[model samples]
Target: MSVPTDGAVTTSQIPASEQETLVRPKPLLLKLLKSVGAQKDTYTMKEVLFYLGQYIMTKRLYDEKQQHIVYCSNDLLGDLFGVPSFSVKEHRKIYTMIYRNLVVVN
Candidate 1:
């Protein structure tokens, strides 16, 4: 009897390298985020917001790169978009609400 391409007896074998490609890589954001409390099989923006809030409370979460992200976003919110500073942390909330509203509130 011969090995099969379909794993029966067709005598065609799958390449070892090709087998590794079967697993799909996760999204970068999804891979980076870890659970604080509530976890879902599929995360919604609400879930992301929840973790983000917890991370913000720690204060050590943002490095220079992440800080740049904040600066850029806050600039957008405060200047380009005409949203107020409101609060230091509130920048994230405003960003999320505005983005979420744009997506679902339509």
Candidate 2:
């Protein structure tokens, strides 16, 4: 919820400080992102998720029988989530896990 609103009008009303906030990921998350070829030192939460989604797609980690389920084929993901697989029903929790790794940069 600390994320600034995306609506143009809403963004205009918000103070400048909130509009362009950026976050740095923790070392573990940073390493994982780098392995996926995202070399940015700072990122918005949305960007982190976008890269993660792309990683999953490229790795073909989605379960064949269950479109809603995703597998953790790599050690990085398993280490982060502490699970071998998860359902998209739990995506919010996974997103929050990554969000928790992001520290706002002042």
Please name the candidate that would achieve the greatest TM-score relative to the true structure: 2
lDDT of 1 by residue, 35-94 (tens): 334333334344444544454345343455453334324432234234443343444444
Evaluate residue 37 in candidate 2 and report its C-alpha lDDT on the 0 to 100 scale.
74
Enumerate residue pairs that collide in model 2.
none
- Model 1 gets an lDDT of 0.35
Clashes of each: 0, 0
Per-model C-alpha lDDT, please?
A: 0.35, 0.65
Q: Considering summed lDDT, which 10 consecutive residues are worst modelled in model 1?
A: 3-12
The C-alpha stretches of model 2 lying farther than 4 A from their native spots are 1-21
101: Cα error in model 2, Å:
2.6
What shift in Å separates residue 25 of candidate 2 from its native position after superposition? 1.0
Candidates' RMSD to native: 18.8, 8.0
